């Protein structure tokens, strides 16, 4: 089914403390796999998944160049946008760029995406047709026009539809064990007395991948108007993800309560109950 | 891989 190859680019201006910071990270699905950062003597693209640790110098030399090139263009763009907005050299500014291509279950291009953001708001967006843009303002309109005159959308569509997809395949293969051989949640329920008369049941879901997951509490196998705390899905550090969902319930009614866990790595949804 | 195509804004 749907896989994706995404890069996320960050350029931050550092007035008279060097040129701007540029960081680039590449994900397949929920798995970071490469990285570039211009804080070092040699800034080089580098692996950040064990399964890239065996890619040869042709890969790294090229992607190094590629990142460098983008960094340098992003310096230019930060200057340019300072201009369009008449801001001083003294201020620090952030330009961000996210792009990706997705596969369908057929193994083929499904959709592509590309967006720019100045100082944390949308600036310029590539439209779903990958043939045109959407500016948010006058400044962006100058950028729209420049891109139009340059057939940028064509060039990006070529990357997104073709090259992006070619390489997503290569990576999915190389990282099969991580990307395709999923990790179901290790799943359990803890009990935490609040007061004399009521407890928190908390349903854990640990070490799962990918990050998409659904935790649900049921009273007598049905919804409940009951306090339902749900924490943001969080990285364990090891490539997997964690999440819990708690409800507070009257002590001695913990058996009315069941946790429902849906995740792609399970063969089937699991239900769960506090075991004394 | 990275895009070989980088917009000039």
């Amino acid at each position, epitope marked *: 089914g749907s896989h994706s190859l995404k890069y996320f680019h960050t350029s931050v201006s550092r007035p008279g403390r060097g040129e701007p910071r540029f960081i680039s990270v590449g994900y397949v699905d929920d798995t970071q796999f490469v990285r570039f950062d211009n804080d070092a003597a040699s800034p080089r693209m580098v692996p950040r998944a064990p399964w890239m640790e065996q890619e040869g110098s042709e890969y790294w030399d090229r992607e190094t160049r590629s990142a460098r090139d983008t960094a340098q263009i992003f310096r230019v763009n930060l200057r340019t946008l300072r201009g369009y907005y008449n801001q001083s050299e003294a201020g620090s500014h952030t330009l961000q760029w996210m792009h990706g291509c997705e596969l369908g279950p057929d193994g083929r291009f499904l959709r592509g995406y590309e967006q720019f953001a100045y100082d944390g708001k949308d600036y310029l967006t590539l439209n779903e047709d990958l043939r045109s843009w959407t500016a948010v303002d006058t400044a962006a309109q100058i950028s729209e026009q420049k891109s139009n005159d340059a057939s940028e959308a064509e060039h990006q569509r070529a*990357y997104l539809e*073709d*090259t992006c997809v070619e390489w997503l395949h290569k990576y999915l293969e190389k990282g099969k064990e991580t990307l395709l051989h999923l990790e179901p949640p290790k799943t359990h329920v803890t009990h935490h007395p609040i007061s004399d008369h009521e407890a928190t049941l908390r349903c854990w879901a640990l070490g799962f991948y990918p990050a998409e997951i659904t935790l649900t509490w049921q009273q007598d196998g049905e919804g409940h108007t009951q306090d339902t705390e749900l924490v943001e899905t969080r990285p364990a550090g090891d490539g997997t993800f964690q999440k819990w969902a708690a409800v507070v319930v009257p002590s001695g009614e913990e058996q009315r309560y069941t946790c429902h866990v849906q995740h792609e790595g399970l063969p089937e949804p699991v239900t769960l109950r506090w075991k004394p | 891989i990275l895009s070989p195509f980088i917009p000039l804004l």
Partner: T-cell receptor
Amino acid sequence: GVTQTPKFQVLKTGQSMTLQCAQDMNYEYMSWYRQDPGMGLRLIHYSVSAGLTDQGEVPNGYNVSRSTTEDFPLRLLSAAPSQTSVYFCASHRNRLTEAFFGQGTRLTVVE
Amino acid sequence: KEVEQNSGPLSVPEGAIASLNCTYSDRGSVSFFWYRQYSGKSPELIMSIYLNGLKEDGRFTAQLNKASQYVSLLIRDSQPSDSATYLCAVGNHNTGNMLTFGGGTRLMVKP
């Protein structure tokens, strides 16, 4: 967009010479190709931006410098008959997009 | 030789379709160009293609097939103005040395 100079040039073996190139488009990338009659262009040297240069396919005999964005002169050190050729400067927005060339310099080096 | 064109020259009757081909060795090539050069003058960009497929502008059609590593140009209704050398250029992303040129094919439109 791209002003290259001069259009013609004769040189004595051993002389040195600097072809000029200037671009109003304010693009990062700039290049020097030579083209011998009947053949394709070959890349001599290029510059990714102000303050940088790289070698191309046939760098030998030639020096380049990129002080400004606007200009990118090519310098023949010690002219030889082999460097009798036509030289084109170009400007480019990205490394691998459209090369915009200049009018060209036709240059014969003679004993 | 990374970009192959046949020098020809090729003849086409005036009014007839001309067809010009180019192959290239590196699967890393991501951008493709047809340049027209009149004897004496600079290369001038006829057409640019990046996506696999067919692209049309006026009398010109270009076709790219990265699977088989060829790019081609078609000129409908050949005119004496179309007589020239035609240059194939690819942008190789594996090597990054700007645009890499084939040797060119000269087209003689005979009336």
